[PDB]
Amino acid sequence: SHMEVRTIKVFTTVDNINLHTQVVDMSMTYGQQFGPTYLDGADVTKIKPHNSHEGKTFYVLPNDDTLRVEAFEYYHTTDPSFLGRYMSALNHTKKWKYPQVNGLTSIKWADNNSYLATALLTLQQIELKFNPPALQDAYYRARAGEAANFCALILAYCNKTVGELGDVRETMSYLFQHANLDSCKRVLNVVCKTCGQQQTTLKGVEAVMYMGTLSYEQFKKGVQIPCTCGKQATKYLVQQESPFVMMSAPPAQYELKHGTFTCASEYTGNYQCGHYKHITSKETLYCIDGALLTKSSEYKGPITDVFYKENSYTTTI
Numbered sequence: 410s411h412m413e414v415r416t417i418k419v420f421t422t423v424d425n426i427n428l429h430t431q432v433v434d435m436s437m438t439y440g441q442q443f444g445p446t447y448l449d450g451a452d453v454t455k456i457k458p459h460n461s462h463e464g465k466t467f468y469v470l471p472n473d474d475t476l477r478v479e480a481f482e483y484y485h486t487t488d489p490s491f492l493g494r495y496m497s498a499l500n501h502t503k504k505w506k507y508p509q510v511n512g513l514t515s516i517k518w519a520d521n522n523s524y525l526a527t528a529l530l531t532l533q534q535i536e537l538k539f540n541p542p543a544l545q546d547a548y549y550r551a552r553a554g555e556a557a558n559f560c561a562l563i564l565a566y567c568n569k570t571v572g573e574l575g576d577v578r579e580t581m582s583y584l585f586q587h588a589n590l591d592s593c594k595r596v597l598n599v600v601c602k603t604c605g606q607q608q609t610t611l612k613g614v615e616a617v618m619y620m621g622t623l624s625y626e627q628f629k630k631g632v633q634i635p636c637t638c639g640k641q642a643t644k645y646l647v648q649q650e651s652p653f654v655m656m657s658a659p660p661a662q663y664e665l666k667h668g669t670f671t672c673a674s675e676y677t678g679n680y681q682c683g684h685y686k687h688i689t690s691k692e693t694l695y696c697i698d699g700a701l702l703t704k705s706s707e708y709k710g711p712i713t714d715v716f717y718k719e720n721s722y723t724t725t726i
């Protein structure tokens with residue numbers, strides 16, 4: 410026997426701004442009508458419409474020409490599963506806590522998220538503007554204290570699920586790919602006693618990141634690196650134009666001196682079985698570990714990333 414058809418009006422979206430009116434049959438699941446569907450992060454694909462859902466907004470995958478354009482303009486991605494990864498992470502990050510620690514939005518530990526807490530604290534201390542409007546909107550909310558959307562977007566952009574381990578340097582590199590760093594320029598010189606000098610110019614993300622030493626002062630004086638001839642070449646910073654620099658190295662015992670750096674990330678333990686902490690240099694040295702806070706006049710620990718302020722630098726060598 411035919412059951413009389415019942416419908417409700419709902420809206421679908423890929424960006425929570427542009428809405429698309431839909432009339433849904435309450436005898437069929439959201440999945441049968443829209444494909445994978447989410448209500449504020451919760452997966453409702455296998456759910457049949459409820460009367461209470463009338464007029465609500467549901468996220469869907471951008472599986473039509475209009476949604477494809479709206480999703481590209483908002484997120485700067487055409488990765489087919491992006492929206493699903495974003496919603497899946499959001500269902501968890503909306504339950505995390507974001508305490509204000511020393512005036513910054515932190516994240517209380519959950520789901521192995523210490524790498525995200527130190528990335529978030531770091532972003533609030535360096536001059537950086539995101540390109541996708543999704544990151545601009547969510548980062549503004551994160552700075553105000555509501556970082557759930559921003560954290561779920563970091564996870565989606567980095568291809569990490571909630572609970573999955575992450576590397577801070579890798580996470581910052583992904584975020585920098587979605588930032589406006591076109592005014593950043595680095596000029597390096599590599600000198601070999603045999604092979605001579607070779608100058609290189611780096612732009613954008615490559616102009617603000619360096620892997621090999623934590624010391625910006627030592628990078629300016631010269632660092633010893635291998636040469637193709639077998640000898641050691643000296644690489645030094647000739648020119649730098651950027652509002653910050655990020656120096657990274659495999660974690661090792663290192664002394665952080667108050668007033669000589671902006672902030673840093675510490676990794677205690679072996680690779681894939683450790684924990685990150687954040688050190689910020691303000692009136693004194695503050696150590697932020699998610700919701701936890703301690704202070705000290707000096708600091709020594711296994712540091713893996715250090716951030717420094719910059720504007721314009723030219724060598725004397």
Ligand SMILES: [Cl-]
Pocket residue numbers: 537538539544545548
């Ligand atoms: Cl921004």
Ligand code: NA
Pocket residue numbers: 494497498499501569570571
């Ligand atoms: Na997830």
Ligand code: NA
Pocket residue numbers: 521522523524525574575684685
């Ligand atoms: Na972590």
Ligand SMILES: [Zn+2]
Pocket residue numbers: 601602603604605636637638639640642
């Ligand atoms: Zn050489």
